[PDB]
Design a protein around this ligand. Sequence first.
Ligand SMILES: CCc1cnn2c(NCc3ccc[n+](O)c3)cc(N3CCCC[C@H]3CCO)nc12
Ligand SMILES: CCc1cnn2c(NCc3ccc[n+](O)c3)cc(N3CCCC[C@H]3CCO)nc12
Length: 127
Amino acid sequence: SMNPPPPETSNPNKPKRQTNQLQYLLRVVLKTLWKHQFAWPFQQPVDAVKLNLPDYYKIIKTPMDMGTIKKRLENNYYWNAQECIQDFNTMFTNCYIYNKPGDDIVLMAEALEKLFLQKINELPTEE
Ligand SMILES: CCc1cnn2c(NCc3ccc[n+](O)c3)cc(N3CCCC[C@H]3CCO)nc12
Ligand SMILES: CCc1cnn2c(NCc3ccc[n+](O)c3)cc(N3CCCC[C@H]3CCO)nc12
């Protein structure tokens, strides 16, 4: 009945690299999603103590949110662009998993996911 600690966002012992892909994922993909009208419930970890969703962390064992993703990109936590893509997909599917078809929050996630898909369509190619 407590929240878990948020996902890890730093690790100064992971080797770091910059790539066109990871730069795009921050400066275009994360940025565009963050500014979307439906982004606000996805900008931080689900707070199941403030929100009254008590079974949330019984159901969602791989939490993810765009606040975390932003930190991970900023701290060069990701080596492969796909690690970041995976985290966006985990965020969307967690919303689908906890909730049910037709729920307002699921329609918000679906809209954000469609946007995600249009932006990643233009991801630069891997090195
Ligand atoms: C307005 C501030 C706020 C936002 N969430 N939240 C919650 N969340 C729990 C929750 C969620 C859904 C239904 N219910 O019934 C409770 C409790 C709570 N408070 C209870 C304890 C005494 C203080 C009082 C305000 C804080 O100091 N205040 C807040
Ligand atoms: C990724 C965030 C998330 C996942 N589930 N969920 C729920 N689920 C409950 C539920 C049930 C039936 C219909 N709907 O629409 C939702 C609500 C909720 N929030 C409260 C309502 C305003 C937005 C938003 C704020 C806090 O993240 N946020 C979330």
